[PDB]
Amino acid sequence: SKELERLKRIDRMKTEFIANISHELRTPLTVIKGYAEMIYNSLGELDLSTLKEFLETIIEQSNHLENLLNELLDFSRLERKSLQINREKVDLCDLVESAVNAIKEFASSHNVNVLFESNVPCPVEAYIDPTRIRQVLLNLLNNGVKYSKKDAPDKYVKVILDEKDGGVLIIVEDNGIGIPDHAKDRIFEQFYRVDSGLGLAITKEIVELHGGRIWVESEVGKGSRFFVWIPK
């Protein structure tokens, strides 16, 4: 019954995940579909200045649809364990930088500071999928800011780049609420939370696809460190 209860909860939360993303997909479709009809029906008469503005919207809107479609695609490829990886010779220093950069504003909204130090001279080279590893970083960093300690004067998230055992190690450090001793393996299970949009499960899969491993070290209420190791 532990399995039957497990499966009936998974099915529950898959249903909900799908219901949400279906609904999200609908709006940009409406705007695109709408804006193309506006352009179509007024075909002769439009200002170029305004033609430009209308297309910009159809473009921007189709991008939102792509992000949403890719989130739905990822969820599916995780289920079928058919998620794939496109490795490139890339510098990890600039990529980390870029992610730290990407997250900077959100971190300010919760008064958390973002920090980077590499223990090896840049550029640090690695044959990895830049987009997928960038996504791994964003998720970890994002969580650092989300689960930071409400009563901490110096809320931070830190990224430590290094070169261990013929590969690369990446630590994401945090002075937030930490993680209890029961949930340490649990938090990498899709949809799993601590109190009663793909998260750490897809991060785990990406990392393991590269051949690496991911783990956490936490003192409850004091620190959290997420470790990511990847070969060369």
Residue 75 belongs to what H/E stretch? helix 48-79
Residue 27, both tokens = 């709006």
Q: Which does 19 bind (CB under 5 to 8 A by kind): ligand ADP, a copy of itself, none?
A: a copy of itself
Q: Which residues pair with 169 in a beta bridge?
A: 162, 229
| Annotated binding-site residue? 174 | yes
Residue 208, both tokens = 């393991």
Decide: residue 143, CB within 10 A, 0-12 exposed, 13-18 middle, 19+ buried: buried
Q: Does 61 bind ligand ADP (CB under 6 A)?
A: no
- The CA distance from 9 to 14, in Å, is 9
The single residue among 132, 143, 159, 207 that binds ligand ADP, judged by CB under 6 A, is 143
Q: Does 206 bind ligand ADP (CB under 6 A)?
A: no
- The CA distance from 121 to 188, in Å, is 32
| Annotated binding-site residue? 139 | yes
Residue 74 belongs to what H/E stretch? helix 48-79
Cβ proximity of 78 and 205 under 8 Å: yes
Footprint of a copy of itself (CB under 8 A) = 3-4, 7-8, 10-11, 14-15, 18-19, 22-23, 25-26, 29, 32-33, 36-37, 39-40, 43-44, 48, 51-52, 55-56, 58-59, 62-63, 65-66, 69, 72-73, 75-77, 79-80
Q: Does 224 bind ligand ADP (CB under 6 A)?
A: yes
Q: Does 199 bind ligand ADP (CB under 6 A)?
A: yes
Q: Which is nearer to a copy of itself, 174 or 205 (CB)?
A: 205
* DSSP letter for each residue of 116-130: EEESSPSPPEEEE-H
Place of tokens 């709006």: 27
Q: Does 204 bind ligand ADP (CB under 6 A)?
A: no
The single residue among 28, 130, 176, 212 that binds ligand ADP, judged by CB under 6 A, is 176
In the complex, the residues that contact ligand ADP under the rule CB under 6 A are 139, 143-144, 146-147, 174, 176-177, 179, 187, 192-194, 199-200, 224
Binding-site members are 139, 143, 146-147, 174, 193-194, 197-200, 224
